[PDB]
Amino acid sequence: RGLLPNHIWQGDVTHYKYKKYKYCLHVWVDTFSGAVSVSCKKKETSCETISAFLQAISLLGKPLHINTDNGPAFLSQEFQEFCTSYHIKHSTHGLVERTNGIIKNLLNKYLLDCPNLPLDNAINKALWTLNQLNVMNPSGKTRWQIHH
Amino acid sequence: RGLLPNHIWQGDVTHYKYKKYKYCLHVWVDTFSGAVSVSCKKKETSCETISAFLQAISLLGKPLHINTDNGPAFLSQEFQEFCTSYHIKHSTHGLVERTNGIIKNLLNKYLLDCPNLPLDNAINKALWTLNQLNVMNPSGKTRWQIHH
Amino acid sequence: RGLLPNHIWQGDVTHYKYKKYKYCLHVWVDTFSGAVSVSCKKKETSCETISAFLQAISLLGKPLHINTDNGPAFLSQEFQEFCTSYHIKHSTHGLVERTNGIIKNLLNKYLLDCPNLPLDNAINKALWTLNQLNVMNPSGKTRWQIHH
Ligand SMILES: [Mg+2]
Ligand SMILES: [Mg+2]
Ligand SMILES: [Mg+2]
């Protein structure tokens, strides 16, 4: 739906069980490039949501428009004030699901390749692998090449 | 005073009290874009000054010319050798104060939003928020957009 | 041998003794820009090799072609599958040695400047110093300027 990179992003929190803890993967994806940010958090309150959103922006640039679900972190006064103050349009009207699934498959593969190592490493390598290594179809480009 | 990004930077150390420790915020700011680096350090010796300066350069690019105060870390043989070896003009002739103040206000806001979380997180989110989110006047651009 | 940045990289693991432990510096260098990645690892199995290679790619971009020695991490089924899946040509035919030496000299200098601080800090500052600060001859440019 975005017409160029950083026009319109989609965001949701998805859940990932590892060692009997259910982590909150905060996931943002550009609707034009398919480029992704994901932050592994223990929670999904406004303090973690704003934080993941800043991580995403540091990696992808500032979006003009974000679309989320009606989850309460996204509807909090803290998140609306953030978006208003920094001129980010926020609406609340599949890309994220499909991106979640690709993330989780890479995350699982990296956990098994390196079982000794922390969850954060696997998330990181999943993230960078998807954006920079993965060649997309029909374009022949990576998300990173289309985005930047 | 700089004519384009990375022509001339201003640098100083400012102090920030948190939990009865006075941290040294090493702050560099581009005089053209207003783009900022800040590193939270426990000290301001040459080893920390060179380190913050490398953090700044990794984030902003290499400057042609830096201007500092006469603080001893900046006048150390270690810092002069660094600047000489890598062809960075160093002179020792408000932008930093005003930038300090904006940093500290964002840092305080993030500490109160997230009281449970470490100082480093608040510094980081202050830093990225100021460079990438904040829209400057009359230009309508962020520091990041002007700088890069 | 590369005709522009990210055409052809050279990679090897070199060893660095610090406090009676022999670390594995995984080193990648672009044959055109001379730009470098180095990751300090405890080991050189496929899990660490793929990880250092992702660190390198995050910093330098995705290469078309990599050349390594016949070390077993590079010949592992895991590393060949990685290269095949993401369309990176891998051959197994001085740049790395000379780069190792420059890295190690900067690493030693930073350890002595800051003896109190961890090895990882010295590696990091060595890495960024070499890519961004060091002016190369006859070009007058840093590795970073040529690469990006
Ligand atoms: Mg949701
Ligand atoms: Mg001072
Ligand atoms: Mg070898």
Chain C CB contacts of A146 under 8 Å are none
CA quadruple C67, C71, C72, C75: dihedral, nearest 10: 20
Domains of chain B, residue spans: 1-148
What CA–CA distance (Å, rounded) separates B9 from B3? 11
Question: Phi, psi (5° rounding) for residue A57?
Answer: -65, -40
Question: Phi, psi (5° rounding) for residue B17?
Answer: -85, 125
Q: What's the gap in Å between B115 CA and the centre of ligand 1?
A: 25
8 Å CB contact between B35 and B29: yes
- Looking at the DSSP bridge assignments, the partners of residue C14 are C25
8 Å CB contact between C30 and C2: yes
Of the candidates A32, A39, A25, which has an alpha carbon nearest to the alpha carbon of residue A10?
Answer: A32
Helix axes C46-60, C77-85, angle to 10 degrees: 30
Closest partner CB to A78 (pick from B113, B121, B128): B113
Nearest CA in chain B to A56: B128
Of the candidates A31, A102, A24, A101, which has an alpha carbon nearest to the alpha carbon of residue A67?
Answer: A31
Instruction: Please state, in angstroms and as integers, the Cα–Cα distance from residue B2 to each residue in B10, B29, B63, following that order.
Output: 10, 11, 10
- Could you tell me the resolution of this structure in angstroms? 2.3
Between chains, do C62 and A132 touch, taking CB under 8 Å as contact?
A: yes
What CA–CA distance (Å, rounded) separates B124 from B114? 13
Handedness of CA B119, B120, B122, B126 (dihedral sign): positive
Residue numbers after which chain C is interrupted (C to N above 2.5 A) read: 93
Between chains, do C125 and B57 touch, taking CB under 8 Å as contact?
A: no
Between chains, do B54 and C144 touch, taking CB under 8 Å as contact?
A: no
8 Å CB contact between C128 and B62: no
8 Å CB contact between C60 and C3: no
- Best probe of the C interface among A133, A136, A147, by most C CBs < 10 A, is A133
Residue B45's CB is within 10 A of a number of other CB atoms, namely: 17
Q: Are strands C65-67 and C8-18 parallel, antiparallel or unpaired?
A: parallel
Residue C77, chain A, CB below 8 Å: the answer is no
CA quadruple A95, A147, B61, B101: dihedral, nearest 10: -40
All chains having 3 or more CB pairs closer than 8 angstroms to chain A? B, C
User: Which helix H or strand E contains B6, and what residues bound it?
Assistant: none
What CA–CA distance (Å, rounded) separates B37 from B55? 8
What was the elucidation method?
Answer: X-ray
Of the candidates A42, A8, A26, which has an alpha carbon nearest to the alpha carbon of residue A103?
Answer: A26
The two tokens of residue C61 are 């971009």
Residue C62, chain A, CB below 8 Å: the answer is yes
Question: Phi, psi (5° rounding) for residue B6?
Answer: 65, 20
Between chains, do C86 and A135 touch, taking CB under 8 Å as contact?
A: yes
CA quadruple B19, B23, B28, B29: dihedral, nearest 10: 30
Chain B contacts in chain C segment 86-145 (CB below 8 A): 113-114, 117, 121, 125, 128-129, 132-135, 142, 144
CA distance A107 to chain C (A): 13
8 Å CB contact between A67 and A88: no
DSSP-assigned letter for residue B42: S
Instruction: Please state, in angstroms and as integers, the Cα–Cα distance from residue B125 to each residue in A44, A50, B51, B107, following that order.
Output: 17, 9, 20, 8
User: Which residue in this structure is represented by tokens 């022509």?
Assistant: B7
Closest ligand to C-alpha of residue B44 is 2
